[PDB]
């Protein structure tokens, strides 16, 4: 029920997913496994998260229990920013791989676009915006293409089977395309109605780039309208809308009882009209920006 | 009134822009505007009048009106020469054409990488990338077109070095591998495209800002405070940049308002008048590689 997007490194990608991001630690365990067995094959992570070890529980019930094989599973995580330091990437990826308990991520982006000075892991995990040093934000002098080759080198090692980037504006993108041997096979973005990025989605996706979407929008007239058009729910709508052009999708919601609606949306089609309605909805307004961090110039 | 760079050479907060001058005009436009005042010359291999730039210089100096060191030129490397190995070729035609030793600061012009033509084939190239009107790409990284630049300011051959239409993600970047940081950024910039995070960004980080508006003399805001001010809207918009730090390129020069344009230093804008002319960033932009073959560099 769920089709899958073969990436550029050749494995297949399931074009919709189930977000680890803001999952509690206390039950994150419990919910991934329930996702599993509501039908969820992929799993959205990230260093960030905090909660890498619970999902590798969630997982490893399920594969313990017989429910799946760890080569049914897709496993997403994302190479936080103080660890863009060829040395440290590595140092990264260890922990990610320990607490998740495999052998390899079947996906490792780099989360943004950004590098914050080095914190060990024993210092602060996950060190989200500390830099070392109270609540100064530091930065290290590491090219984004360094960071990309030491991804490189881990996939020969085996231990991720394919690379990508989050949050990356076509500019940098491009730029990368240039230098990298593997290319970026994933592009995640902050993508919906209010920001989406029409040029950007279009030269990823023509440079064999995998575009994967992340994040009222259930109350405005034009969702509401196309909704009760195809007798479908707003969420639905959203997510067919991206599903629709190709891209995969990690759905905002999932409570319990939404797991298996948030994933089996796509029985009708959007057409060319509703398409230029809800472009006109797009005001690039973007919730997920740097900017308000320090000031870091990644959008503009 | 000059900027001292990031490299520490000065640069004249007023130049006059080569973009667009006439063959036939260069050197004689060129050779007025020095005798006008102007010492900086923003010009360009793409612009394909460098050889008459370089007329209008020798005339000036042969003259004994100024001395080569007192003449800034700018020029910028073209697309088709991103490759570190093509990079002081294109250089060289750039030293020849306008027949001096060194440039005083050479531009990476655009953040895009064209594949080589031989200057015998085509110069300048333009959008022709040797295959009919194909446009066909190279695989050079912006810092490794970067290193060959800091190669040959080490050769004596490039006074400063910066960079063109350069997004924030990319200029960032750029910074966290460059050992001569870029020291000037030189961006489509007016009251419709103010881009005052970037303009923001690249100021702290010591960047200096030339501003060009190449592609509001008759709009409402500008005109009441130019007729308040009494002075041409003109003077107003290059008042409103240079008083934040920007070096401009006045996008005209016409021989009456040559002294004009390198004379509006005048007066200042208040905080209000800043705030007016605030109101009028709407985000257009009119120079974008997008309409050329969709090139995602402000996307």
Redesign the interface.
């Given at each position: 029920s769920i089709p899958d997007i073969k990436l550029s490194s050749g494995h297949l990608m399931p074009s919709i997913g189930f977000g680890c991001w803001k999952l509690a630690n206390a039950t994150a365990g419990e919910q991934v496994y329930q996702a599993i067995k509501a039908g969820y094959r992929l799993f959205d992570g990230a260093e960030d998260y905090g909660n890498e070890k619970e999902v590798g529980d969630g997982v490893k019930r399920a594969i313990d229990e017989g429910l799946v094989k760890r080569e049914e599973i897709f496993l997403t995580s994302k190479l936080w920013n103080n660890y863009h330091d060829p040395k440290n990437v590595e140092t990264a990826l260890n922990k990610t791989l320990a607490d998740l308990k495999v052998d390899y991520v079947d996906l490792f982006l780099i989360h943004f676009?950004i590098?914050f000075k080095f914190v060990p892991i024993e210092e602060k995990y996950p060190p989200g915006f500390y830099c070392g040093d109270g609540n100064n934000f530091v930065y290290?002098?590491?090219?984004?293409?360094?960071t990309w080759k030491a991804l490189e080198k881990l996939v020969a090692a085996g231990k991720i089977k394919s690379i990508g980037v989050s949050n990356?504006?076509?500019?940098?993108?491009?730029?990368l395309?240039?230098?990298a041997t593997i290319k970026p096979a994933v592009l995640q973005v902050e993508h919906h109605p209010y920001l989406q990025?029409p040029?950007?989605i279009?030269?990823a996706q023509?440079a064999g780039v995998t575009i994967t979407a992340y994040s009222t929008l259930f109350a405005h007239d034009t969702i509401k309208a196309i909704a009760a058009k195809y007798n479908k729910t707003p969420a639905e709508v959203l997510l067919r809308w991206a599903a629709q052009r190709g891209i995969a999708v990690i759905p905002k919601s999932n409570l319990p009882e939404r797991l298996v609606q948030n994933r089996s949306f796509n029985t009708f089609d959007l057409t060319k009209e509703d398409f230029e309605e809800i472009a006109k909805l797009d005001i690039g307004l973007r919730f997920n920006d740097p900017?308000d961090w320090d000031?870091?110039?990644?959008?503009?």
């Open positions: 676009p590098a290290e002098d590491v090219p984004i293409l360094e990356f504006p076509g500019a940098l993108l491009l730029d395309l240039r230098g990025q040029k950007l279009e030269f023509k900017w000031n870091i110039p990644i959008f503009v």
